[PDB]
Design a protein around this ligand. Sequence first.
Ligand SMILES: [Mg+2]
Lengths: 125, 135, 191, 210, 199, 210, 296
Amino acid sequence: ELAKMIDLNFARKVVEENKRVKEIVLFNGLTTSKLRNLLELINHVYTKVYNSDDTTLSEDVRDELEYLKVKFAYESGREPAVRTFIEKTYVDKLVDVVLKKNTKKIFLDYCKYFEALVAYAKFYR
Amino acid sequence: LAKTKTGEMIDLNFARKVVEENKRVKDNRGRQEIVLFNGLTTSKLRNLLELINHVYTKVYNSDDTTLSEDVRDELEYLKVKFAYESGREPAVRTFIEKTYVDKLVDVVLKKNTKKIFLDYCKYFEALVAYAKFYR
Amino acid sequence: FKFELSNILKGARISVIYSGGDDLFLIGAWDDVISKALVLRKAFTRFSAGKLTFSAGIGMYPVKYPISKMASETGVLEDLAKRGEKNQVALWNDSKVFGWSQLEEQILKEKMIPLQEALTNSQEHGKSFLYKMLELLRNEDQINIARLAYLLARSSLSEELTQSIFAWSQNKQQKVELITAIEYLVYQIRE
Amino acid sequence: YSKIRIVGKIDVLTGLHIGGGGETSMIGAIASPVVRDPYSRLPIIPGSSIKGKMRSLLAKHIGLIPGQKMHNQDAPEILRLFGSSQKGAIQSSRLQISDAFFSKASQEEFDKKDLAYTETKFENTISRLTAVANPRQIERVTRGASFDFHIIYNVENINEVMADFENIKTAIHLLENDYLGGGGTRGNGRIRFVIDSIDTVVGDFDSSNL
Amino acid sequence: YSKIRIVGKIDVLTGLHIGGSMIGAIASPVVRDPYSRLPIIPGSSIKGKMRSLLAKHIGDAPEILRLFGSSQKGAIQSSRLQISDAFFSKASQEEFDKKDLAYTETKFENTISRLTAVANPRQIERVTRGASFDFHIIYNVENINEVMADFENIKTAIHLLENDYLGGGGTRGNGRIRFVIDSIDTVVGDFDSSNLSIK
Amino acid sequence: YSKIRIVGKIDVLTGLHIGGGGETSMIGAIASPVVRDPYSRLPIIPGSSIKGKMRSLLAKHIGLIPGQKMHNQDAPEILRLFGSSQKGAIQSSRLQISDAFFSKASQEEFDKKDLAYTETKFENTISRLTAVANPRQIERVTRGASFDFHIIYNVENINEVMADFENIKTAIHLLENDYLGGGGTRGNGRIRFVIDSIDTVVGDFDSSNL
Amino acid sequence: VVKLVKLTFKSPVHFGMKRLSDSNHTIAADTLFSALIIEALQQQLELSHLLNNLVITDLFPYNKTSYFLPKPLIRIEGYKAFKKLTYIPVENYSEYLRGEIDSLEASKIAESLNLGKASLSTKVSLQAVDHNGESEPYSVGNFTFYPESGLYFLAKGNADTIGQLEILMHALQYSGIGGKRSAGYGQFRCTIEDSGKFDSLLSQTGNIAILLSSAMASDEELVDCLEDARYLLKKRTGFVQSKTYADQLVKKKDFYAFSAGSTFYQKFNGKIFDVSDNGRHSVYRYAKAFWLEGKI
Ligand SMILES: [Mg+2]
């Protein structure tokens, strides 16, 4: 329940629409490696978030999430396919609302949404 | 990290705003090519980023929470190199003066903390990545 | 109830504790008990022109388990099954109150048999894959469904079976049906 | 009848992977998480792992009866110390080895240096046929971890106390050589029982010379 | 006649599997309150462990029989220790509801056989460390002359229990507990129990 | 039941890269860093890496059965030395190779020489259809550093201990001829072994011959 | 003066009826009276008031909403729903007596009882492993009442008897009730208060009388009270619980008493039956009658 709706069903349906078959090509040609690198960054922040027990995001994880947004923008600039994927799934906007909420729960559902995106992207291939 | 004039803070979203402000479409011969910081390309940006990269690696390997004297002299040489490069090319001069990086290195020298230097490195990352993104 | 029931259970490891009056208390191997309960339901529908219905409860207990506890717990199962509307079969845990058609076809026919044939035909996957699917399905969190998809992506299973498993996991009733089919197959494939 | 505590510490010399379960793996996260006590969310060494490793090593040193199918067929010293469950002839265990928790000292030295308690070691599996890797993440425990191992010894036969403690010494020496937890064959598990403090908690037994 | 109430908490030092289904599930679930589903400590487990420890320290003994009841021929004695079930405390309920912590945990264990070196998985449910149970004990003062002695015995038992385990695989590091005797208040009779302490 | 402990030196002949993920990398910095002991923050040769490399080299040396889809099915000497997992035929692992940590001798040598134990190597992929290069930064371990590797061998079959230690020596030689860690086909991972001492820590076996 | 005593149970109760593996959710008046006698002996009080003048009912369920009563055994003008029905709330009692409760309402009433949940806890005995042999596992059936529920009863007697009952119930709170009261079961807290709805209900004259306690009359009363009456003879038995009765535990003489809810057209005052046999003290069994009159 992040924003507008944005849920795991949104992830499955958006991967379905952006899927096109010629071979299977998703999000105008996004390889699984770029998505895996993005998920690796997600894992790097998520491990630190999970290890801490307090329900409020610390300053360190907030700075790491701003870094994650910057990395998202860099990846979009590097490859058009990653840019189209980021725009169609609005991941950076979810990062922004996670920053706005300052709650561990919102980050956790954001990570769940990202993992659902990865899972459905692999499944439809 | 630090503070600029008019009360504006130094952050990664500030780097986004700075790169956006210095973006002009500047169509030529019917072709839409994006120019940043009044003629600045990405080769100069990568050179400056590598200059930051060397000191970042040196500070990242060390476990000390206080900036070593060797890294302090690294940063002084960084200031000298930044001044030289800005003097060389007007576009790099506008880039340096608009992003306030030359003041930021002074702030990180005064703070004398590894964390502050890492934050400044992240800010320079935001600058270069966001310049790549808007292009 | 008395003469024909002996013919009904012929060939199965069943010891009829008592046909009594209308109620039937029967003890045997779990596989044979369930199969013969289904056959009994079908024969009971054939008899009396299908205007009579009967509710049954089936329970799983270890061999060393006391008989009194077996009787009491299967009785509570049948009480829960008859608590619903007309015929029900309260197989195993109270959360598995099924119907006769549902148990015979929707659980042991459309789901169990494809899983079995995939297991025996495949040379690379075994019981651990089924246990991973079961762990995914038992979890109530929605994200697990997506995880299931990922597993089914690298499962090397047939595409038709993959899509059917995904569809079953999406729906609630079909999810519990697939859970029951997986548990039954694991029980049948143990040791 | 006396109760003697052997509270001390365990110095991990390499990573320590005592796996667990009950948690589904988030995509790209740790495939095999280390066991953690849920309240503190810290890696622990369950007393079951310690007792099993000590018993297995001591049984190997003393000798296993050929064709030993059950743990209750070990040598009578092992059954006397670690416990046995035969039919009618049941021997109570004089050793009670508790879960070893993450030490507060190690917690402080890991909060300093900004170091995570566990280390997500990144591994692969090169197949013999196609020579293709297979990534794996194992949540080992870092080298600086110290665990507060807590053992209770119950003195039942006063005459065998000395021999039992010699057995314990041999087993802990064997454990100083052998690993604790899984993956020990591939670098994990090395430990050293450096820190000890033995005293009689309950009774009148002499614990100075133990 | 007098009855002395001993209330307190049973702090869990290692996951307590007091013992008491589907494939790939908890093979040995702990006992739960039938409605609340909260894990509890059966008072029979406490009474049995304390009786065993007191008997081992003492050594059928008259003290054990007079404290924990005897049905033997001739010597019929009413048990003086009525140890009620220890229920999950509200404070631990709140502390576990925060940080979204499950009341129990599922320890995965195995057993390497001495013959084939094969392992056998085992999902033991244990009440998670840091869980507090509101234990409750009643002492029946049948005779005023042997109160103190019995209390001494009780103390011994409790002391032993704090170095031993409660129900479960305690020798493998389960169920270590600590009694926090919140009070010892007389509820029936005029007997004064201020000077008696369990610990 | 005696444990024979091997302790020796692994001196890096060339740069050593053993990758590990989960580390945030700055733009233009090391893209693929080496594994680090989180405590010492120093390069480390994991015991898993050494054991896997040695087993792979030995199994290639003696031979691989065709269609070998699993590691359990292999030459039985490797099963005895390093372990097995086959259903109904589990063989205990007689070799427990542990992590190789950065020695104080080489660390102090580098400290006196004013050298960092790691190095950043610049490389690039030149696509040849367009002659377009894509650069990368790999971390390596500075040549001249030394690690202390510590193996423990359990003597279960006394008759074949000589053959088993001969196999260990042969595997060590195979690790000499080859690399360890990341892409050594391009020049990384060269190492050197210096066997410091072989002894019998626990038990009554004779270690003079070995 | 009739006092409503409500017991809220802190721990699950055994309340066996014929064995240990079962768990009834209530107890008869004889069980409660024997508990009161044991308490009055322990507290060194005088048993004259409990015996000569005290009339108590069974333990009946009560929820957060309604106080339940036994279903009277009266003729019905479907049938299985009424047979399964056991308890009727006080509000729906006079309606049931007049027959206005149909099968659906009876089934809804039966489902409306939220007294609690009955479970079976399996226990072990390790008194043989220490010497030689194996552990002996047994099972105890317990019944955990829902948080707002409880078991109530009514007591009738003199003011002195009411005070003595209050003292005995205060001691019983910690003594425990039901079986296995020394192994963790049966602990409860009791509240004694004047009853308003029950006082109005019992001060009602009807054509029939309903037993509220397990009772039985002597020879003279039984020759007149058996006229076209519907009842249920329940077998009250058990071993003797005392220290000064015999060297080994000795069973009582078998007793049979009318169950609660039985309907009789003639009201009989019961007597306390001595079910002792070769013992040092008479083992009393409560069989006095608590009558509630109704119209059908
Ligand atoms: Mg019937």
